[PDB]
Amino acid sequence: QRNVLELIWTQDFSNIQPSEFGGIVLEAPKVPKNIYYRAILVGMDDRNDRPIWLYWLMPKVKLDKLDNQTLNDDNVIEYKPTLKAFRDDVVGYSVAQGFA
Amino acid sequence: TDFYTIKDAQADLAIAPLNLTVLLAPYSTTPATTLESPTDGSLAIPPGYKSVGHFEKQAGLTLGNEFDSKDIEAYGEPEPIRTIINKRTTTFDFAMYQNQRNVLELIWTQDFSNIQPSEFGGIVLEAPKVPKNIYYRAILVGMDDRNDRPIWLYWLMPKVKLDKLDNQTLNDDNVIEYKPTLKAFRDDVVGYSVAQGFAGPGWRDLVATAGFGEALTALTITPGSPTVTVATGASHTAQLLVEGDNGINYTPDVVFTSSAPDKASVSAAGLVTGVAAGSATITATKGALTATATVTVTA
Amino acid sequence: TDFYTIKDAQADLAIAPLNLTVLLAPYSTTPATTLESPTDGSLAIPPGYKSVGHFEKQAGLTLGNEFDSKDIEAYGEPEPIRTIINKRTTTFDFAMYQN
Amino acid sequence: TDFYTIKDAQADLAIAPLNLTVLLAPYSTTPATTLESPTDGSLAIPPGYKSVGHFEKQAGLTLGNEFDSKDIEAYGEPEPIRTIINKRTTTFDFAMYQNQRNVLELIWTQDFSNIQPSEFGGIVLEAPKVPKNIYYRAILVGMDDRNDRPIWLYWLMPKVKLDKLDNQTLNDDNVIEYKPTLKAFRDDVVGYSVAQGFAGPGWRDLVATAGFGEALTALTITPGSPTVTVATGASHTAQLLVEGDNGINYTPDVVFTSSAPDKASVSAAGLVTGVAAGSATITATKGALTATATVTVTA
Amino acid sequence: TDFYTIKDAQADLAIAPLNLTVLLAPYSTTPATTLESPTDGSLAIPPGYKSVGHFEKQAGLTLGNEFDSKDIEAYGEPEPIRTIINKRTTTFDFAMYQNQRNVLELIWTQDFSNIQPSEFGGIVLEAPKVPKNIYYRAILVGMDDRNDRPIWLYWLMPKVKLDKLDNQTLNDDNVIEYKPTLKAFRDDVVGYSVAQGFAGPGWRDLVATAGFGEALTALTITPGSPTVTVATGASHTAQLLVEGDNGINYTPDVVFTSSAPDKASVSAAGLVTGVAAGSATITATKGALTATATVTVTA
């Protein structure tokens, strides 16, 4: 999907218009773009129908590195990014852990 | 909101490159801007691109992305405030099986167009005295065929060069394979080093879910009052186009029907042929959406 | 043409080794190209081949053929694009009685 | 609706291969698309397919199907989000009795067409230095004759190769048996590896019950109203053809009767002969269904 | 309290699937939530579910359940502190006999609805190039007829896929048998993979003993005091419906009797008819329990 591909390519693809039959082409930028995102990593543990939601809030995340992709005729294509957290001045922290 | 709704995961967006192929072209060949045929959205390879044939299955094709990064840290901060990606190197490697001329030229960094076979067909390929820096244009196109609606996902690299070559071992039970690594450079004419693209009826189905453009909600049709002729001639047939609100032609996806086949007989592709004078209704439906057109037929 | 004619079965082509013998020769013996006497077509064993005598009936003589092969698999092909058969190993065993 | 009606079991759809036949052809033979003769629906084997003869009874013929697949597993999902099946490997094994050229060629992976018998008929077959990859075309046709109506059920494998060979045990009270396993591969020209087919008058009876096509409801005479001549010639006789609504020719199944045999005498096969000038009604009746056709006989 | 009372065994709760049938539907069919008809409690199969016919008696139908779980082990604790069970894989296998369309489609993993019989009825089922992931809806329903009061015991699997195929041996004294294994997957819409259900008059007798709901203690006639008319019309007859404290409709089980048949004649099903004006007492008695209701018949 578009947000995954935007993260992978460090490019904004909001202006990408599909062709007459749906095809799209996502060129990589001439210079990689330093784009920051906000990340919510939320996990659910279902115990006795009383779930526990444990989450990590990272207000500022950037693509630090991207793992090599191997194309195998028996596996789907996976994109494996590593995202580094930075301290956000507005919220005052880089990573927070919470429960609900 | 429940966890499944928040996740909103789609399995259809997972694309498996069931059949992949690599096409190389000389640097003089005009680069491929897209692999989608303008007339019908089929797979269209530009002339000059030639496939490298079969390659190893277990090795697969590996795409490597390498980031050079620099940490910017401030005097009043303990952690680095920013990071800068100075460059992003793209490479891809695979193990070709066939011993054809373009494969051998890539392996030996030599142009073997002037190599003339001997009287009995034997050829001799000499490695150049100094290795030659040759650039090619690469197309890595893979097909995932699902429900007879294939998705063609491809990588276009307008400028690739042989970076390294893996050691080859001869075994009396294995064919000889050549395993090159090709590094992608930025082409000035096209302005990019690597591009990724999607095409096919499956991708036409999945664009809205993927989030490119806008979701298909209105099924508009070509001008709905076409005049057709019963007698054979220029105006004995008329072609109809079915478009969505997002500027995507859905004619192959929709189903063409005629309420009055006597007046205008409609084909699957969307061609109405005048058979008897009067008026006919042509309906193209897709899921809940539909489009209608009133065709006039004249003797 | 009916099913019987299509099958064209011929029981006379089924051969039962009612009697059997194994003849062993030293490696210096000239190998037997054929067991057919050129003079009259009768059974002719070359000199140097000596029978091992009786062997067990219930055990019989068992022949076994094994293949070792490697399949060259290419991307996108469910079936191998080439099969390299290195050899076909043949063995046979029996239970000799005589000392 | 009771349990018996819900089950709706039909023992007539259970088919027992009372007789079986294995026909092998060289890879250069044109593959068999179908075993049904276009002229009359009888069993027709294409030229080049030669039967292997008798095979062992107790072992029978064993068919084996294996699926290889990889499951893509996503986080939090107990079941795979996508199963990628690569191929369906099909094999069949049987124990041949006859020491024929084709059987010996199959078991020794060698062409013995150049082998010449000696002055007294003796032959010597040598195993090749390296076993050869020889492909064949296989037909596995079985007959189940019920009430003088046969059902031929067959498997067509356009490309079969010797996979493994079972041990041969020589016993002073048994014949030589060759037990090969044959693996089926995909033939690109015909586009399949295995095809299962049915044919025969019994299958013609059982098609609608089996659920292919549509149930027979009425019989229509395609010639309609033919004209014959009392004088001998091309127009002396006419051949009738009857077809159901489902598109099946029921000429062998129907019974041809003539109301006026003096004018147009009808035969069992459906030939009307111009005995005398006039008009005759041929009434072909199959079960409850029937069809009437008028035949005009002129001098 | 002795050992026999403590055991409290009830052989009547042992149900034997004396007959059994497997019904398969395409994945587009609406899944069966239950097999009990709301109108009268009889066996009701939703449309689209087609039975596969006979299958081998000796093989039977085998149901297999497997658990995958991970144990979290803490220092000093011999037993896991938490067992995480990922899923419960359910499979079922059986050896079907009939050579019908849905059976063949299941075994070959291909839709054969487009297959047209030839001129003489012959069909050829070409195997797909790549096996397809085709899901079905399965109902495994068996009947135990016990003193003309049957118990229907069924398994509902809204999503079943072919998992493996057993070897297929052809013997000149046996019919063709297809032995597939079908694995059940969770269906999101219905929210389950396997559901076991019971129904029938015998199960209605056995519910309270089995321990679902509450034991029946008294019978209550819901219509209470109805009014019918001597004249023919809508009010000529009335239908009575008796329930219990547990909420079970015992109308088929009870016996309808009228103290005054001259006024309101009662039938076995529970229909009172206005024969003559007056009052009649309908006394429905089941075992020891009984319920009396007055019916007023007006002119």
Report the first-to-last Cα separation within chain E, whole angstroms: 61
What is the distance between the alpha carbons of residues B166 and A88, in angstroms, rounded to a whole number? 46
Considering only the beta carbons, identify the residue of D21, D54, D150 that sits closest to C14.
D54
Residue D204, φ and ψ in degrees, nearest 5: -60, -35
Query: Which residues in D lie closer than 8 A to residue A70 (C-beta atoms)?
Result: none
What is the distance between the alpha carbons of residues B194 and A11, in angstroms, rounded to a whole number? 13
Task: Test D98 with C18 for CB contact under 8 angstroms.
Answer: no
Strands in D168-170's sheet, in edge-to-edge order, are: C82-93, C61-72, D168-170
Q: What is the 3-state secondary structure (H, E, C) of chain B?
A: CCHHHHHCCCCCCCCCCCEEEEEEEECCCCCCCCCECCCCCCECCCCCCEECCCEECCCCEEEEEEEEEEEEECCCCCCEEEEEEEEEEEEEECCECCCCHHHHHHHHCCCCCCCCCCCCCCCCCCCCCCCCCCCEEEEEEEEECCCCCCEEEEEEEEEEEEEEECCCCCCCCCCCCECEEEEECCCCCCCCCCEEEEECHHHHHHHHHHCCCCCCCCEEECCCCCEEECCCCCCCEEECCEEECCCCECCCCCEEEECCCCCEEECCCCEEEECCCEEEEEEEEECCEEEEEEEEEEC
What is the distance between the alpha carbons of residues D249 and C88, in angstroms, rounded to a whole number? 53
> What are the residues of chain D with a beta carbon less than 8 Å away from any beta carbon of chain A?
70, 72, 82, 84, 86
Q: Tokens for D153?
A: 């059920």
Query: Which residues in B lie closer than 8 A to residue A86 (C-beta atoms)?
Result: 79-82
In order of D73, E237, E238, E258, E295, the CA distances from E298 in angstroms are 72, 11, 13, 17, 10
What is the distance between the alpha carbons of residues D143 and C6, in angstroms, rounded to a whole number? 11
> Residue E207: which H helix or E strand, with range?
helix E201-210
* Burial call B55-90: b when 16+ CB within 10 Å, e when fewer: bbbebbbebbbebebeeeeeeeeeeeeebebeebeb
CB B155 within 8 A of CB B196: yes
Query: H helices of chain D, where?
Result: 3-7, 101-108, 201-210
> Residue A5: which H helix or E strand, with range?
helix A2-9
- The secondary structure of residue C30, as a DSSP letter, is P
Subunits with 3+ Cβ pairs within 8 Å of C are B, D
| Length, in residues, of chain B | 299
Residues with Cβ < 8 Å from D174, sequence gap 6 or more?
Answer: C16
Q: What is the resolution of this structure in A?
A: 3.0
What is the distance between the alpha carbons of residues D127 and B211, in angstroms, rounded to a whole number? 64
Tell me how close the Cα of C89 comes to any Cα of chain B, in angstroms: 16
What is the distance between the alpha carbons of residues E104 and D8, in angstroms, rounded to a whole number? 17
Count other C-beta atoms under 10 Å from residue E188's C-beta. Answer: 10
Q: What is the 3-state secondary structure (H, E, C) of E57-116?
A: CCCCCEEEEEEEEEEECCCCCCCCCEEEEEEEEEEEECCECCCCHHHHHHHHCCCCCCCC
Q: Tokens for B11?
A: 């399995």
Find, among B33, B25, B43, B23, the residue nearest to B152 by Cα. B43
Find, among D198, D240, D192, D191, the residue nearest to D220 by Cα. D240
> Residue A83: which H helix or E strand, with range?
strand A81-85
Task: Test E133 with D83 for CB contact under 8 angstroms.
Answer: yes
Query: Which residues in D lie closer than 8 A to residue E126 (C-beta atoms)?
Result: 191-192, 195
Residues with Cβ < 8 Å from B152, sequence gap 6 or more?
Answer: B35, B43, B141, B142, B143, B198, B199, B200, B203
| Number of inter-chain CB pairs under 8 A, A vs D | 9
CA angle (D199 as vertex; D194, D200 as ends), nearest 5: 160
Chain D residue whose CA is closest to A76: D72
> What are the residues of chain B with a beta carbon less than 8 Å away from any beta carbon of chain C?
18-21, 54-58, 60-61, 97, 172-175
SS3 D238: strand
Chain B residue whose CA is closest to C82: B175
Subunits with 3+ Cβ pairs within 8 Å of B are A, C, D
Query: Which residues in D lie closer than 8 A to residue E98 (C-beta atoms)?
Result: 9-10, 13-14, 210
What is the distance between the alpha carbons of residues E206 and B109, in angstroms, rounded to a whole number? 84
What is the distance between the alpha carbons of residues B53 and E274, in angstroms, rounded to a whole number? 90
Q: Is B5 exposed, middle or buried (0-12, 13-18, 19+ CB in 10 A)?
A: exposed
Tell me how close the Cα of E250 comes to any Cα of chain D, in angstroms: 21
Query: Which residues in D lie closer than 8 A to residue B9 (C-beta atoms)?
Result: 74
Q: Which site among C70, C75, C77, C81 would you substitute to test the B interface, given the most B Cβ atoms closer than 10 Å to its Cβ?
A: C75
CB E91 within 8 A of CB E140: no
